[PDB]
Design an enzyme around this catalytic site. Sequence first.
Site, PDB file in Angstrom:
ATOM      1  N   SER A 219       0.861  -1.211   0.000  1.00  0.00           N
ATOM      2  CA  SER A 219       0.000   0.000   0.000  1.00  0.00           C
ATOM      3  C   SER A 219       0.892   1.253   0.000  1.00  0.00           C
ATOM      4  O   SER A 219       1.512   1.501  -1.053  1.00  0.00           O
ATOM      5  CB  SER A 219      -1.023  -0.082   1.138  1.00  0.00           C
ATOM      6  N   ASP A 242      -0.538  -4.227  -3.675  1.00  0.00           N
ATOM      7  CA  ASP A 242      -1.677  -3.344  -3.555  1.00  0.00           C
ATOM      8  C   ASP A 242      -1.190  -1.905  -3.270  1.00  0.00           C
ATOM      9  O   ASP A 242      -1.565  -1.284  -2.292  1.00  0.00           O
ATOM     10  CB  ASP A 242      -2.665  -3.875  -2.489  1.00  0.00           C
ATOM     11  N   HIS A 297      -7.827  -5.571   0.659  1.00  0.00           N
ATOM     12  CA  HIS A 297      -6.545  -4.878   0.892  1.00  0.00           C
ATOM     13  C   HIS A 297      -5.671  -5.520   2.012  1.00  0.00           C
ATOM     14  O   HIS A 297      -4.458  -5.586   1.928  1.00  0.00           O
ATOM     15  CB  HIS A 297      -6.829  -3.427   1.255  1.00  0.00           C
TER      16      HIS A 297
HETATM   17  C1  LIG Z   1      -4.332   3.866   4.758  1.00  0.00           C
HETATM   18  C2  LIG Z   1      -4.297   3.138   3.416  1.00  0.00           C
HETATM   19  C3  LIG Z   1      -5.501   3.621   2.607  1.00  0.00           C
HETATM   20  C4  LIG Z   1      -5.368   4.623   1.652  1.00  0.00           C
HETATM   21  C5  LIG Z   1      -6.462   5.053   0.928  1.00  0.00           C
HETATM   22  C6  LIG Z   1      -7.697   4.492   1.144  1.00  0.00           C
HETATM   23  C7  LIG Z   1      -7.846   3.500   2.084  1.00  0.00           C
HETATM   24  C8  LIG Z   1      -6.759   3.065   2.811  1.00  0.00           C
HETATM   25  C9  LIG Z   1      -2.901   3.292   2.768  1.00  0.00           C
HETATM   26  C10 LIG Z   1      -2.079   2.192   3.380  1.00  0.00           C
HETATM   27  O1  LIG Z   1      -0.859   2.146   3.470  1.00  0.00           O
HETATM   28  N1  LIG Z   1      -2.925   1.253   3.822  1.00  0.00           N
HETATM   29  C11 LIG Z   1      -2.511  -0.039   4.342  1.00  0.00           C
HETATM   30  C12 LIG Z   1      -2.503  -0.084   5.844  1.00  0.00           C
HETATM   31  O2  LIG Z   1      -2.269  -1.437   6.249  1.00  0.00           O
HETATM   32  C13 LIG Z   1      -2.313  -1.737   7.585  1.00  0.00           C
HETATM   33  C14 LIG Z   1      -2.517  -0.820   8.608  1.00  0.00           C
HETATM   34  C15 LIG Z   1      -2.541  -1.244   9.920  1.00  0.00           C
HETATM   35  C16 LIG Z   1      -2.364  -2.575  10.200  1.00  0.00           C
HETATM   36  F1  LIG Z   1      -2.388  -2.991  11.486  1.00  0.00           F
HETATM   37  C17 LIG Z   1      -2.159  -3.510   9.203  1.00  0.00           C
HETATM   38  C18 LIG Z   1      -1.976  -4.903   9.526  1.00  0.00           C
HETATM   39  N2  LIG Z   1      -1.831  -6.001   9.782  1.00  0.00           N
HETATM   40  C19 LIG Z   1      -2.134  -3.081   7.881  1.00  0.00           C
HETATM   41  C20 LIG Z   1      -4.326   1.604   3.623  1.00  0.00           C
HETATM   42 CL   LIG Z   2     -10.416  -3.592   0.476  1.00  0.00          CL
END
Ligand SMILES: C[C@@]1(c2ccccc2)CC(=O)N(CCOc2ccc(F)c(C#N)c2)C1
Ligand SMILES: [Cl-]
EC number: 3.1.1.47
Length: 371
Positions: A219, A242, A297
């Site tokens: 992400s 992702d 995700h």
């Molecule tokens: C905020 C993001 C996003 C951006 C736009 C729209 C929606 C979401 C960007 C990003 O880096 N994301 C991944 C975060 O993954 C995580 C967080 C906390 C956790 F504890 C774990 C675990 N295990 C995984 C989603």
């Molecule tokens: Cl999702």
Amino acid sequence: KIPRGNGPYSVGCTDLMFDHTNKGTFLRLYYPSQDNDRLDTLWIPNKEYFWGLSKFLGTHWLMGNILRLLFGSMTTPANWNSPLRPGEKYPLVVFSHGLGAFRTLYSAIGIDLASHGFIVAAVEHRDRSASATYYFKDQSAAEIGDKSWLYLRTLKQEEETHIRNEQVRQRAKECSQALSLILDIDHGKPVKNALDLKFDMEQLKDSIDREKIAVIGHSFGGATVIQTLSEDQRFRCGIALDAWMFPLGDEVYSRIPQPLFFINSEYFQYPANIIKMKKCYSPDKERKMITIRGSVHQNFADFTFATGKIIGHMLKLKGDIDSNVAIDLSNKASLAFLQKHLGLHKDFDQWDCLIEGDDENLIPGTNINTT
Ligand SMILES: C[C@@]1(c2ccccc2)CC(=O)N(CCOc2ccc(F)c(C#N)c2)C1
Ligand SMILES: [Cl-]
Ligand SMILES: [Cl-]
């Protein structure tokens, strides 16, 4: 339970902080280990991480205590401080976590890679994108274990463009710095781990295959992959899991010489994000993309393994696809890509089909329409 690696190596785990400061490197290592009977590794090792997670989710810090109560004795199947498996130079993966995550939450991936003969350095970023992280304010604080904590920075809407870009570039530099640290350790430079752990870093001397280096991330960490690659030619390929593309500057799309693999969830992606992925494409550059059917995700992170099927589905930690099936596909596709683009002499080419999306649980390219 977080699953064990599928590869033939036992896996060990430790933490490295050097230097002790908020500009130093902080990472979790996963590595091929000797056979041992050491305890498994504590998944979320400090109460402060749960408080941080509470802030990320936007709840009362008291919800931190409930998360802790629930998940705070949970382990992941890597053996803590087990000796490194001698007599082989291992390719290196630097791994970048997402926003609101931190170094320990991608162990499913780290362990699997290590189990197939990679060393994995999961960085903890000090850009204030981690839910929490820590450093030491001076040498004495380091010596006695007196931690200073930095928690997630929440942004006003008006800051997002500028600060997210600032963050991704800092994330890139942190990836580069962590690589340089591991390379120094490989060459034999004494490093005093600010963490006072019973894992002698001298083991890692002459253990790294210095030319076979990859960056991978989830992400925010996926955008980090692309920034790091454009900035640091020592990384020979990247895998973006992702990717959240928003933080990247417009200049970078055309500046990624290395092979790049996009592995997506079915449900996270959207045209704006996919268009940016597509801007990285060019006929002289190697790119692949796949989408895991039924996946969400969070299939790429460890919380997908932390609850049951029902609670997990309700929380969007799980998708329609089984979490083990999903991560196995991502991990094996990843291993085939790495073998091909680092020039490994292993048997990961058996999952070459997965890179092309050729499996009942994969979609070649993307399900997202962008015309
Ligand atoms: C905020 C993001 C996003 C951006 C736009 C729209 C929606 C979401 C960007 C990003 O880096 N994301 C991944 C975060 O993954 C995580 C967080 C906390 C956790 F504890 C774990 C675990 N295990 C995984 C989603
Ligand atoms: Cl999702
Ligand atoms: Cl032990």
